[PDB]
Design a binder for this molecule. Sequence first.
Ligand SMILES: COc1c(F)c(F)c(C(=O)N[C@H]2[C@@H](O)[C@@H](CO)O[C@@H](S[C@@H]3O[C@H](CO)[C@H](O)[C@H](NC(=O)c4c(F)c(F)c(OC)c(F)c4F)[C@H]3OS(=O)(=O)O)[C@@H]2O)c(F)c1F
Length: 138
Amino acid sequence: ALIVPYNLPLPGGVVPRMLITILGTVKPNANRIALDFQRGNDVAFHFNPRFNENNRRVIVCNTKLDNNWGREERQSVFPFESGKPFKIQVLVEPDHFKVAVNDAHLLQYNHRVKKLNEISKLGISGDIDLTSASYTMI
Ligand SMILES: COc1c(F)c(F)c(C(=O)N[C@H]2[C@@H](O)[C@@H](CO)O[C@@H](S[C@@H]3O[C@H](CO)[C@H](O)[C@H](NC(=O)c4c(F)c(F)c(OC)c(F)c4F)[C@H]3OS(=O)(=O)O)[C@@H]2O)c(F)c1F
């Protein structure tokens, strides 16, 4: 049981082979969830499940630079369910973040922010009960 929004420091930023694991439960009637991997005020990787965008469920990913959102990356697969426990794993690889939900690969997001070792915070927010947030090197 962690308070949301939660900040997970990433000391010395991220690096390939770093695995971030988030455990929680989606609230009933959730509207959205967000993971924000931040480089100072910039958002290197925003991962944003939306439960009701024009009555569709979609995950939006993007980068924020100098307070400007870039071009969104959207795909169709939506593994979250209101009221249910989830696991998000974010594995940093050399050219992308690799995301799996509930042990199934979901998406990749290519690195736009190049200075990986300055992406030194993960913010976790939105309509979840957050159980734990941690990292390990694999
Ligand atoms: C298929 O359907 C669509 C569509 F319907 C669209 F509208 C778009 C379109 O691009 N929509 C974007 C457009 O309307 C743009 C214009 O400013 O605004 C973004 S919204 C923006 O999108 C960003 C990523 O590009 C962020 O997701 C951003 N959200 C947050 O900052 C945010 C959040 F994600 C949270 F989860 C959150 O609380 C947990 C919160 F407080 C937030 F502020 C969020 O800002 S907020 O909705 O005002 O909060 C739309 O996605 C689209 F591409 C599609 F493909």
